[PDB]
């Protein structure tokens, strides 16, 4: 039940230093190495470092000028700090438990959970928060309307988490304006429709931005 | 240097079986590696770790579906009975000293899934949004597979290209795909139609909804 949960900024200015953090609960950070790996939208994944706690700290040639890996125990947490940040390090950041170091000196290299990763954008831009507007509705469609928002990304859920079958939250669009757009919509039977509620609960970290939006005939 | 080479794509049929493939360089031909797996929208999860001598070890919770295997500087995730679900990028993973490296991924398609046509729903601009001074038609494109359509807007019959964006298709939690198109209009462009019309072409065949103010 180790569970890894990567945080930090979602927007970063160009030649500023990202600053992440990877808390580990269920189990202790000791004994084992943790990885730092990238994946910029639609490419692979790319490794960036790791740290043990008392062995030692290495990463990536070409990123090693840039990158510092550091750990704290009383936090059970790993952090990462890229500094001079370019359009280039926006990605998703990942943390992953790596091999287990015995402490004869042996070792069993793994890479068996990974965290669930944190968006970073690197622009000038300011963060905005969402407009959101209902899609009002034997079965019929409702959904969500959330505009013109920045960095990405926004999550929604429905009827505060409790609805969750015939929910799809598309992929955004990126305007003209820079900023982004999506929807979410939900499949519901025609003869709830007088009965249920149906209320998109969004969902904007980067702004802390919270909103609900009832979808009603 | 270590390098692992995949190529970058893989096919078969659904309820085949398939060899995803990774080849370590030459120097470095008998390490172990791991296989993680990154299905649409999601972060990666880890398979298992392939040993040199052949044997390999599953992460908890992985289907008995997933096996690996070893020949010379090659490694192998054979996935069997192939589902939707296995529908993702597969990239490889190794350990040398004091580095990690990934494999560049391999995208496996399921062929031969169930034919299904889209469910189409058209959106008017909301009240809301209306008083908020703006318009936005939202075309609503759903459970269809293959996952490939053609959107065409009109305005009472005429053609509208400018203002619109259309997602591509995403596969839905129930496997079949969706999509979401958008025509950004102002609303007294919107008031001054009779009707606006979202025609979606899936397959060569045409499914149109209208809706007017
Ligand atoms: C902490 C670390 O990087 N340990 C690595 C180990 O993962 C790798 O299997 C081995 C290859 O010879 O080299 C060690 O230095």
């Known amino acids: 039940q180790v569970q890894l949960q990567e945080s930090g900024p979602g927007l970063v200015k160009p030649s500023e230093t990202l600053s992440l953090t990877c808390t580990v609960s269920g189990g202790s950070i000791s004994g084992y190495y943790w990885s730092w790996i990238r994946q910029p939208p639609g490419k692979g994944l790319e490794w960036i470092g790791y740290?043990?706690?008392?062995?030692?700290?290495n990463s990536n040639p070409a990123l090693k000028s840039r990158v510092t890996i550091s750990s704290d125990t009383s936090k059970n947490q790993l952090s990462l700090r890229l500094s001079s940040v370019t359009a280039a390090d926006t990605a998703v950041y990942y943390c992953?438990?790596?091999?287990?170091?015995?402490?004869?000196?042996?070792?069993?290299?793994?890479?068996?959970?990974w965290g669930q990763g944190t968006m970073v954008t690197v622009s000038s831009a300011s963060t905005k928060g969402p407009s959101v507007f209902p899609l009002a509705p034997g079965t019929a469609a409702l959904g969500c309307l959330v505009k013109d928002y920045f960095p990405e990304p926004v999550t929604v859920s429905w009827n505060s988490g409790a609805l969750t079958s015939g929910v799809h939250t598309f992929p955004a669009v990126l305007q003209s304006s820079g900023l982004y757009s999506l929807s979410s919509v939900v499949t519901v039977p025609s003869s709830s429709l007088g009965t249920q509620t149906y209320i998109c609960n969004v969902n904007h970290k980067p702004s802390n931005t919270k909103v609900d939006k009832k979808a009603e005939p | 240097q270590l390098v692992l080479t995949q190529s970058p794509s893989a096919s078969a049929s659904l309820g085949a079986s398939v060899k995803l493939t990774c080849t370590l360089s030459?120097?470095?031909?008998?390490?172990?590696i791991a296989w993680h797996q990154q299905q649409p929208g999601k972060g990666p999860r880890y398979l298992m770790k392939?040993?040199?001598?052949?044997?390999?070890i599953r992460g908890d919770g992985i289907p008995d579906r997933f096996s690996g295997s070893t020949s010379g500087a090659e490694r192998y995730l054979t996935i069997s009975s192939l589902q939707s679900e296995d529908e993702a990028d597969y990239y490889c993973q190794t350990w040398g000293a004091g580095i990690r490296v990934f494999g560049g991924g391999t995208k496996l398609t399921v062929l031969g899934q169930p034919k299904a046509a889209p469910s189409v729903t058209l959106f008017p601009p909301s009240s809301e949004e209306l008083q908020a001074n703006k318009a936005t038609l939202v075309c609503l494109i759903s459970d269809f597979y293959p996952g490939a359509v053609t959107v065409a807007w009109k305005a009472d019959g005429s053609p509208v290209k400018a203002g619109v964006e259309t997602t591509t298709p995403s596969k839905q939690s129930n496997n079949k795909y969706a999509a979401s198109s958008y025509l950004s209009l102002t609303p007294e462009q919107w008031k001054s139609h009779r009707s606006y019309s979202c025609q979606v072409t899936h397959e060569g065949s045409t499914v149109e909804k209208t809706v007017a103010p």
């Open positions: 740290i043990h706690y008392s062995r030692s700290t």
């Open positions: 992953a438990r790596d091999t287990y170091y015995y402490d004869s000196g042996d070792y069993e290299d793994a890479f068996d959970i």
């Open positions: 392939v040993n040199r001598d052949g044997s390999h």
């Open positions: 030459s120097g470095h031909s008998n390490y172990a």
